[PDB]
Amino acid sequence: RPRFSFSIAAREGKARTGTIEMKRGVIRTPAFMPVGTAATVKALKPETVRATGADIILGNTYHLMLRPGAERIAKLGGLHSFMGWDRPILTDSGGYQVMSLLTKQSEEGVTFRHMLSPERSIEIQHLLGSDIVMAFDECTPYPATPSRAASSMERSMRWAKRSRDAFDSRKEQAENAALFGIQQGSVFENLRQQSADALAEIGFDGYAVGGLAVGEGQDEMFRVLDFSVPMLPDDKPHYLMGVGKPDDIVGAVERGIDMFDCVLPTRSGRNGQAFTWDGPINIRNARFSEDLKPLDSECHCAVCQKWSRAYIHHLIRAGEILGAMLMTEHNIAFYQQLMQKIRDSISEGRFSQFAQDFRARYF
Amino acid sequence: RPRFSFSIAAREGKARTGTIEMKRGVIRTPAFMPVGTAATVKALKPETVRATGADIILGNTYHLMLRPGAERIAKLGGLHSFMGWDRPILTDSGGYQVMSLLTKQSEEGVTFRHMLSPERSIEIQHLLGSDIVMAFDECTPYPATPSRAASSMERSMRWAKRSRDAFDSRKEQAENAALFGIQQGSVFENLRQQSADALAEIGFDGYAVGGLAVGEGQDEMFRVLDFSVPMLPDDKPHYLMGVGKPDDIVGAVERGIDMFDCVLPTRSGRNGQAFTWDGPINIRNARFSEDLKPLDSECHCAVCQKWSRAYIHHLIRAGEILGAMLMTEHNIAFYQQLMQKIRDSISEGRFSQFAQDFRARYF
Ligand SMILES: CNc1nc2c(CCNC[C@]34C[C@H]5C[C@H](C[C@H](C5)C3)C4)c3nc(N)[nH]c(=O)c3cc2[nH]1
Ligand SMILES: CNc1nc2c(CCNC[C@]34C[C@H]5C[C@H](C[C@H](C5)C3)C4)c3nc(N)[nH]c(=O)c3cc2[nH]1
Ligand SMILES: [Zn+2]
Ligand SMILES: [Zn+2]
């Protein structure tokens, strides 16, 4: 396999389905990437994550640099060996924590004491042995004034160039990993354009839409996606960072997005929320106490083949670890099944009908 | 398979190895039974528990009657269907909580508000669909004066008769399940004898040694086992309740015990203690932070085939669920491997040498 190749096999409107080939495996797109902070997809063994259909998982610079440490993970053989996942890994750069968290910021980077800069972030991702490296950016807070959004975005573009140069200066990283740039600009079309232009001028293997799912709501997110994704190079993958609920994903795919990551299936699962084709349910609710049906009626996952809502209701109410294990496996499988249905419907030219059918039932 | 059959295949001294055949499967003895309070072996799927080699698991009247409720579990199909374990299940009767916990006691039973009595305990075990039912007893506290130990023991024997009669009066239970009586008497030989005599006069399918592992220490426990186990019928299984550390198990087998249950491999695992043939280790200790070896060098479990001490060290320190999953799988597998080595060494007539070798290395 090559270091990186994206090929588009079918289109419907702005939607695309295809594959990313990398040394450690193939990624079917549109793709959902389960996430983790501490070198684990919470409550799942890697083999379980792979069984749900995930092709790639996501890790993060900020948390792994604190614990167990990037240098430590490299001494131990890298992240793949450490956690036992041998397929591609994408790592975020720390740029969302630049917003979400404790800091002193400057053009050099951000101090948290721990420092992150374009160079340090790319170095940490190298030490982890990430397959897809994210540029170090600033997720602009929402709302932002145009002036502030512009200043933030411009800094991110300078950081994007520094990220590219750091990555290219490390031959092993440049020969075996991919680098994605991240578009900023808040909700403003001209800033989004300026950012896309800067990023394509630098040149990346893939392009993320950053700065969304930060409180603007779905309607505004979709409005921004409407003009922002066509600004990105068509022939490279488009990654929407931190999205989202099943209906967010469907709409985003309709607007040209190829890749997604979100804590929702994992986190929500441990809190008792199960995704179903009839919408989400909270398994802790008393109405499930004697319900022998599986979480979802059509789901193919191992949890729905064997255990009832009633049992899982009990496990979550009792604070049992197996409750979190089962809910998480189901929700990740659900998400993977959603992505499969999306890929199949685009390849068959019936995605708009699927999106319609999906929404009528889910809502 | 019959309702219940115990056959002894080999002996060495007081030690025995054999099988218990029941409708839901065969149990190899000496046996270790993983336990749970809430219709789960904590942090493990049933299939994982079975893969470690367990033939039978233990549940408990007291906790399941509180949550999710015995009647509820029966409405849902019984414990086996509910939790997804189709092999035998032994249930304790609530008698240890009579000691360990909130109560008003009388000859009728104990109020906790929830009531337990011989009749109610046996009924709950029926509703759960337990394969091996424990008589409802009182675990005498330690230390106890001879007078108090006797009074307690006598009440337990009256409760044992009531337990037998309740069990026999329910034809489905009597035809498909087994009933074990529990010997009391504290540390006093004459009371232990009186109790064994009472229990054999009633007649049970198996006999438990109750009232130990309640703070007397190993030396005293062994001294009591020395005279107490030969008081029990030789041709029925001998179950030591709530024991124990690997060396407790080896010594108890040397004194004629066939069956064991303990929270240690599960609980200790979630707290960071791993069992190894070189003794227990606390994986949280900094000395393991960069240790690429598995938990144990010889263990056959899936965790030792794939992950390092370093990774599991990280998981436990980070409070990750997968840390508890991995530690628990390993410790239960370890315990099952110990039992296999014990069974093999008795069947080959080299158990005393194994016990010796085991202790030299473990300590
Ligand atoms: C929620 N909406 C949202 N997320 C966003 C992220 C993080 C993506 N998820 C990774 C992450 C973040 C947290 C939570 C988990 C694990 C680990 C820490 C990595 C996912 C973002 N990351 C970067 N670098 N830049 C953004 O603009 C950005 C915008 C986001 N908008
Ligand atoms: C620790 N030493 C010890 N245990 C003992 C138990 C409980 C066995 N384990 C079941 C149990 C108990 C707790 C903890 C887990 C799950 C569930 C609740 C069932 C194991 C005992 N049970 C009964 N009926 N009688 C005893 O004399 C007795 C003595 C014990 N001495
Ligand atoms: Zn499912
Ligand atoms: Zn092991």
UniProtKB/Swiss-Prot annotation, chains A, B:
> Residue span of the signal peptide, if any?
none
Which residues lie within the region annotated RNA binding? 242-248, 266-270
Keyword set for this entry? Glycosyltransferase, Metal-binding, Queuosine biosynthesis, Transferase, tRNA processing, Zinc
Documented effect of changing residue 261 to N: Abolishes catalytic activity
- Bound cofactor: record note: Binds 1 zinc ion per subunit.
Q: Identify the metabolic or biological route this protein is part of.
A: tRNA modification; tRNA-queuosine biosynthesis
- Enzyme Commission code(s) on record: 2.4.2.29
Q: Which residues bind Zn(2+)?
A: 299, 301, 304, 330
CC cofactor: Zn(2+)
- Catalytic activity, per the record? 7-aminomethyl-7-carbaguanine + guanosine(34) in tRNA = 7-aminomethyl-7-carbaguanosine(34) in tRNA + guanine
Ranges in coiled-coil conformation: none
Tell me, how does this one assemble?
A: Homodimer. Within each dimer, one monomer is responsible for RNA recognition and catalysis, while the other monomer binds to the replacement base PreQ1.
Which family is this protein grouped under?
Belongs to the queuine tRNA-ribosyltransferase family.
This chain's function reads: Catalyzes the base-exchange of a guanine (G) residue with the queuine precursor 7-aminomethyl-7-deazaguanine (PreQ1) at position 34 (anticodon wobble position) in tRNAs with GU(N) anticodons (tRNA-Asp, -Asn, -His and -Tyr). Catalysis occurs through a double-displacement mechanism. The nucleophile active site attacks the C1' of nucleotide 34 to detach the guanine base from the RNA, forming a covalent enzyme-RNA intermediate. The proton acceptor active site deprotonates the incoming PreQ1, allowing a nucleophilic attack on the C1' of the ribose to form the product.
Q: What is this protein called?
A: Queuine tRNA-ribosyltransferase
Primary gene name: tgt
